Amino acid sequence: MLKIIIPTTMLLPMTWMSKHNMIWINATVHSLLISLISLSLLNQLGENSLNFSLTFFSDSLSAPLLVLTTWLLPLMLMASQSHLSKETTTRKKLYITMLILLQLFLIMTFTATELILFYILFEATLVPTLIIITRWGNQTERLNAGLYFLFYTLAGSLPLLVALVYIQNTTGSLNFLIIHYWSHPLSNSWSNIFMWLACIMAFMVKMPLYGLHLWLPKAHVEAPIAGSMVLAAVLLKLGGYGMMRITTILNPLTNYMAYPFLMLSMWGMIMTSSICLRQTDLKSLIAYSSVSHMALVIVAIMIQTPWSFMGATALMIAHGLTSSMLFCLANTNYERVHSRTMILARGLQTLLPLMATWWLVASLTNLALPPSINLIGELFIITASFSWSNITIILMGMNMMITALYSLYMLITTQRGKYTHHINNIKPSFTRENALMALHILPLLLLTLNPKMILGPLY
Amino acid sequence: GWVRPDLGELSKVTKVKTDRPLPENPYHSRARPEPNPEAEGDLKPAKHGSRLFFWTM
């Protein structure tokens, strides 16, 4: 794992010692190179995970997440360098440094062998994200958003810290392999109930679970474009990865401790999808869509079947790509017209045709058109839920309809009709923006050909 | 034939010959508790270092 990690660290002084006009070029080139090297973790043994050393290991659950992180960094650099043009050299280097530190923390968190190291890195991701949001955020509301993002997260994660140190005192280890091989059932007692809650609530608030989701519209809407990209594509998946890891010590209690979280996630799926139908802000709509998708992932993890875990992995990856693409698409128009309101600019297909094609493809993967991997994940989760109880189809069926509705609503409102007469500063699409969209989209389509790579450990 | 002792003589510490046996336990002491065993052996480095959560040294 050292081969991936050291170069990422190297990226730091490479950008601090670069000429003022070459920072973006250098960072993008070597980020792409790092992504290529990482691509080699997808070779998986089968029966067990690849254990590089005592400290790091890679899984089939882990490999897809790492490749997505490393691939997301150059895209964030492409998306950032436009609105950061007026910035001083030192502040541009500081912004790139924040992004690099975030990538470094993320890679380590996914591959840490034991929970305490996972916890420390999973929490260290908070600092660069908060700095990005509050320092480079466009609006006044960013300060409030930063506080919401911090406090919601820490209120969940500190009980997890207490629970983890208690578990290592009683078991003797927090190493994930030892944790798995020496697993013993959790009795049904008040102590075990609160241990379960303390082990679960941090990852629940990271997802986010419905009702503990209020930080996400704030933080995802008030952040700069790269902040939003990394918040939706990767940082939401920390909760899913951590839950998939931690639920091995929680059996057989999960059988009934999962009921309220399943109820919240299914009904709130319906709720956030309906909310997307009456939204005046375009980033707000994409944020709530992310919430709806992660509710599906929460259900999949709580019901604890091989098909549900496979579907959850596929949906996490597909959501990460699609949501980042949608945020970038919204940001291009925002850059044009300097407002987030969805009905301000209309009929953009008449003015920007290729960007309208990108819009259509992103909207089609958001509603999970077959045979995209979005539908693969959603279908696997829906089947597992059907096995869990046949009545889930009603909720699942309803959600599919509302998602199609708001996806095509967004597409029709922004691209179709007639253009607003007054706005006359809509310039042709830049090569940078088109290439950013293609680099989001091509990987998703390519993934359909080889579905097993994003499927996970259960496969 | 009595000679008055000179200055400084009655305050001498002198020796006494006696048949009285020297008392063995004039304090009536109990038996002292046993000490703790002791430190012994060669010092080997701690197995697997410190063993703090994730540290390998």
Ligand SMILES: CCCCCCCCCCCCCCCCC[C@@H](O)O[C@H](CO[C@H](O)CCCCCCCCCCCCCCC)COP(=O)(O)OCC[N+](C)(C)C
């Ligand atoms: C808005 C989103 C927030 C996040 C959602 C958090 C969800 C947390 C809810 C926790 C799920 C259930 C908790 C415990 C499981 C059962 C609870 C209890 O009511 O069940 C009965 C328990 O009996 C009684 O109900 C006692 C509990 C009643 C006192 C709790 C107060 C509940 C009021 C609701 C307050 C809201 C809590 C959340 C705050 C936001 C079962 O009978 P019994 O077999 O005997 O007890 C089993 C435990 N044994 C085996 C050790 C004996």
Ligand SMILES: CCCCCCCC/C=C\CCCCCCCC(=O)O[C@H](COC(=O)CCCCCCC/C=C/CCCCCCCC)COP(=O)(O)OCCN
């Ligand atoms: C952003 C919002 C997130 C909010 C999350 C809050 C809930 C977190 C889960 C519960 C937190 C505290 C759990 C304690 C950590 C686990 C430690 C443990 O398991 O030890 C238990 C101890 O269990 C406890 O003491 C826990 C009692 C609760 C004390 C603090 C109460 C705080 C509020 C509790 C309810 C809220 C939890 C769910 C709320 C979710 C958020 C809405 C058993 O050990 P022993 O003492 O040795 O018992 C057996 C030997 N006789």
